[PDB]
Amino acid sequence: SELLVNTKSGKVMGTRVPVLSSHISAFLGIPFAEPPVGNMRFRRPEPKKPWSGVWNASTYPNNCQQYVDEQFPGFSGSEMWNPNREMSEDCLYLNIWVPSPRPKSTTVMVWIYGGGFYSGSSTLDVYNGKYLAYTEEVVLVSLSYRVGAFGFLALHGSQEAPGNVGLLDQRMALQWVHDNIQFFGGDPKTVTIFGESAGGASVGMHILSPGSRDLFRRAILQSGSPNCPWASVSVAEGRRRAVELGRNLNCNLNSDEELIHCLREKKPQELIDVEWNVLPFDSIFRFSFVPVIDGEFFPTSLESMLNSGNFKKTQILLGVNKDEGSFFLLYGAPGFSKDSESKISREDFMSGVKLSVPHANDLGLDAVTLQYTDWMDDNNGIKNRDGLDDIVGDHNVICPLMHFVNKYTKFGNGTYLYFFNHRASNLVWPEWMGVIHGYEIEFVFGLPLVKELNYTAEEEALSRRIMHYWATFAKTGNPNEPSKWPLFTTKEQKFIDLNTEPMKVHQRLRVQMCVFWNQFLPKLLNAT
């Protein structure tokens, strides 16, 4: 039977899922690792011990314990990212969509959700692979990995909580696909990992980490980059945040073994309730527990790994949305409201800049202030709003990623750069937020193809172009079939807009500010 497939851990049985007047096969909630519970919290994952019987794989799994956003109770635009299934620590499962009839050895794409390494679910509506699998005839996997202290508490020197363990869940799911995707009609020799935001950063980190290079073939990074400043901490820092989260729930502190004992006895929400109390700078724009540069998941510093070319040389397709900064000001800045136009007074703008660059000494702030101000019109509420929004976008995503693509492209076997700047016709957030990050995913997964979702014709049209770009890249290493998307070369730096209009080529994405972010400001703060 199509939905009777026997894996190396036991058999699973799926479900026939409708999709656009046809059907595909879904295998939902397959366990790829033993539940990380009790003695095994904070621990490296261990693979799912094989089970007797048929696994009812017909409903989405649980979601990992995570902070739940209630800034806007019942607002669809923020609830679409909250967990939609019960939260459990028993949350390491993956989901597979397989075209019907079952293909023989075909391209698999594995989706890695973002949400800042504090949140995220495989089971959102926007991550529903039934459309991308069907329309592009690929096998689609979405994995899961633990987030928060459950996934990234780091006490280097300890093997009970070493850190990066949630990156290891993703690799174990990746290993599971490498071991079991042949049976679902997948081609293990052509796996394509892709994810957005913290998903983007994970895809980049598996390109970097030697333990992950051979478990996938190429990579798509949307609005995310392994060198982003919010994506890693040093070893010492991830310790002090573990140490203090201990003290912020009154734990034993003279060592590790006792501080970790004290944290496996606490209930899940207990740490989530105190999650954020460990952030060094007011900052607002950081996340408590994130990957650590431990010296073994990552052998060295990332910059040295990219100058040295110590990563996978393959094909990458990557890009950003126009306004990566909107979401983070709205939730944590002065004068940003989801109901006004959020025009920003100068002094509120000054506040943003100090929040926006956690670390900067006084001189580093005056640098950033001068580079985003128009001093013929510095009390213009709008371009003060738009200026600080750019600061966050430029510093936290766009320029961290251009740095990555520039260093990567010296060594890789191909690079494709996009700039996503279409605001969806049915977006529920205010216009001043522009092309909010995360809202390219709707198109990647072909939701505008669903007529009841009230997208336009040109957005259905735009979606299919993107899924084909993504799918053809996943099958061939290049999104085109012999109008053509140019390769990004070390010397000409071309990229493309993605929107409802005919494709157009530009060079040097936001170079003026990314010179400032990647070269000048680093040298200012190291000086003083």
Ligand X SMILES: O/N=C/c1nc(CCCCNc2c3c(nc4ccccc24)CCCC3)ccc1O
Ligand Y SMILES: *[C@@H]1O[C@H](CO)[C@@H](O)[C@H](O)[C@H]1NC(C)=O
Q: Which residues here bind ligand Y, judged by CB under 6 A? A: 13, 56, 58-59, 413-414, 452-454
Indicate the residue among 22 and 413 with the shorter CB distance to ligand Y.
Answer: 413
Provide the 8-state DSSP code for 277: G
Instruction: Pick one of 21, 39, 483, 528: the residue that binds a copy of itself (CB under 8 A).
Output: 528
Instruction: Pick one of 125, 258, 374, 492: the residue that binds a copy of itself (CB under 8 A).
Output: 374
Binding map of Cl ion across residues 41-80, x = CB under 5 A, - = no contact: ----------------------------------------
Q: Preceding residues of all breaks in the chain (C to N beyond 2.5 angstroms)? A: 482
Q: What is the C-alpha radius of gyration for the chain, rounded to an integer number of angstroms?
A: 22
Residue 84 interacts with which of a copy of itself, Cl ion, ligand X, none, CB < 5 to 8 Å by class: none
Q: Which stretch binds Na ion (CB under 5 A): 117-125, 251-259, 328-336, 409-417?
A: 251-259
Q: Is 22 a catalytic residue?
A: no
For position 370 contacting a copy of itself by CB under 8 A, the verdict is yes
CA distance 62 to 78: 20
Residue 431 interacts with which of Cl ion, ligand ELT, ligand Y, none, CB < 5 to 8 Å by class: none
For position 508 contacting a copy of itself by CB under 8 A, the verdict is yes
CA distance 110 to 406: 25
Place of tokens 């209630």: 70
Binding map of a copy of itself across residues 138-177, x = CB under 8 A, - = no contact: ----------------------------------------
For position 427 contacting ligand X by CB under 6 A, the verdict is no
Residue 284 interacts with which of a copy of itself, ligand Y, ligand X, none, CB < 5 to 8 Å by class: ligand X
For position 115 contacting ligand ELT by CB under 6 A, the verdict is yes
For position 517 contacting a copy of itself by CB under 8 A, the verdict is no
Closest residue to ligand ELT, based on beta-carbon distance:
197
Pairing verdict, β 54-56 and 10-13: parallel
The answer to whether the beta carbons of residues 415 and 408 sit under 8 Å apart is: yes
- Residue 467 φ/ψ region, left for φ over 0, alpha for ψ in the -120 to 50 degree band, beta for the rest: alpha
Q: Where are the alpha helices (DSSP H) in 279-398?
A: 302-308, 326-332, 346-356, 362-372, 381-393
CA distance 27 to 510: 42
For position 79 contacting ligand X by CB under 6 A, the verdict is no
Residue 332 interacts with which of ligand X, ligand ELT, ligand Y, none, CB < 5 to 8 Å by class: ligand X
For position 256 contacting Na ion by CB under 5 A, the verdict is yes
For position 75 contacting ligand X by CB under 6 A, the verdict is no
Closest CA to 99 of 141, 129, 139: 139
Indicate the residue among 337 and 454 with the shorter CB distance to ligand Y.
Answer: 454
Chain residues 151-210 in contact with ligand X, contact rule CB under 6 A: none
Q: Is 324 a catalytic residue?
A: yes
For position 507 contacting a copy of itself by CB under 8 A, the verdict is yes
Start-to-end CA distance of the chain, whole Å, equals 67
Instruction: Pick one of 56, 71, 84, 255: the residue that binds Na ion (CB under 5 A).
Output: 255
Closest CA to 445 of 198, 140, 127: 127
Residue 114 interacts with which of ligand Y, ligand ELT, a copy of itself, none, CB < 5 to 8 Å by class: ligand ELT
Indicate the residue among 256 and 390 with the shorter CB distance to Na ion.
Answer: 256
Q: Sign (positive/negative) of CA torsion 310, 312, 313, 315? A: negative
What's the closest the beta carbon of residue 303 comes to a copy of itself, in angstroms? 19
Provide the 8-state DSSP code for 398: I
Q: Is 196 a catalytic residue?
A: no
Rounded (10°) CA dihedral 13, 85, 337, 354: -80
Pairing verdict, β 316-321 and 218-222: parallel
Residue type, 335: G
The answer to whether the beta carbons of residues 504 and 496 sit under 8 Å apart is: yes
- Catalytic (active-site) positions: 197, 324, 437
